[PDB]
């Protein structure tokens, strides 16, 4: 099940949801919460749902008429004439799924560092390597992540480190060591807490 993206919504409306059918090799390609592009066809699927009223229906064109004792009326008459409701619903049948905004322009696919690097293009990894070698990268990331926020440098730095996170571990006894930091901003009104959260969300 997918649903309408937020930028597509008209005024006063809830996002429409349609169910897309993925087949043989596209079959695991869209995960919950993923912004995806689906290429395929919009199809109708006969759905069994009525009592809005009797609606459109199909029946034989052959002019049969039940004899006395077998009058083609009621349920026997509907069964004899092959009467069925022509009720349908729209469904997308996707031949192909792609991320809407791809991360690396090269090629998606175990997610090791080399897999991510191979996933890139040449210019993309030029940039990645460049900024990895960037002295003063910490400040540059803080400034390029929160441009419109003045001051609050520590909050920028901490939110950045949250974005990068630590290393999860497992103890021999089975204890799991948390490897990603949590940050809480406490502040007076209008000090841009919601703005930090919106920056990170977007």
């Amino acid at each position: 099940r997918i649903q309408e993206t937020q930028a597509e919504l008209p005024r006063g409306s809830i996002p429409r949801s349609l169910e897309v059918i993925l087949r043989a090799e596209a079959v695991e390609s869209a995960q919950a919460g993923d912004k995806c592009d689906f290429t395929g066809t919009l199809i109708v699927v006969p759905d069994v749902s009525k009592l809005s009223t009797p609606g459109a229906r199909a029946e034989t064109n052959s002019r049969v008429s039940g004899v006395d004792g077998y009058e083609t009326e009621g349920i026997r008459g509907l069964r004899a004439l092959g009467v069925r409701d022509l009720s349908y619903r729209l469904v997308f049948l996707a031949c192909c799924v792609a991320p809407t905004n791809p991360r690396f322009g090269g090629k998606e696919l175990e997610q090791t560092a080399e897999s991510i690097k191979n996933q890139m293009t040449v210019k993309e990894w030029e940039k990645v390597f460049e900024m990895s070698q960037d002295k003063n990268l910490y400040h540059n990331l803080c400034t390029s992540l929160f441009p419109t926020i003045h001051g609050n440098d520590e909050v920028k730095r901490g939110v950045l480190l949250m974005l990068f996170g630590g290393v999860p571990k497992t103890t021999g006894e089975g204890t799991s060591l948390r490897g990603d930091i949590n940050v809480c901003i406490v502040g007076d009104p209008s000090t841009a807490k919601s703005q930090f959260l919106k920056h990170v969300e977007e």
Binding site: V67, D68, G69, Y70
Partner: protein, 49 residues
Amino acid sequence: LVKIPGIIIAASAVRAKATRISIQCRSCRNTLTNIAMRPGLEGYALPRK
């Protein structure tokens, strides 16, 4: 529709063949009147319900 000549060598007794029949249900006693019978040597199968 054919037209043939001939000599008649036997004539059965005149009997009674129904043109319309009425049938009644054994339990609810409701009737299924004025069922039209086909003319000629043709029979009728009663409704089974």
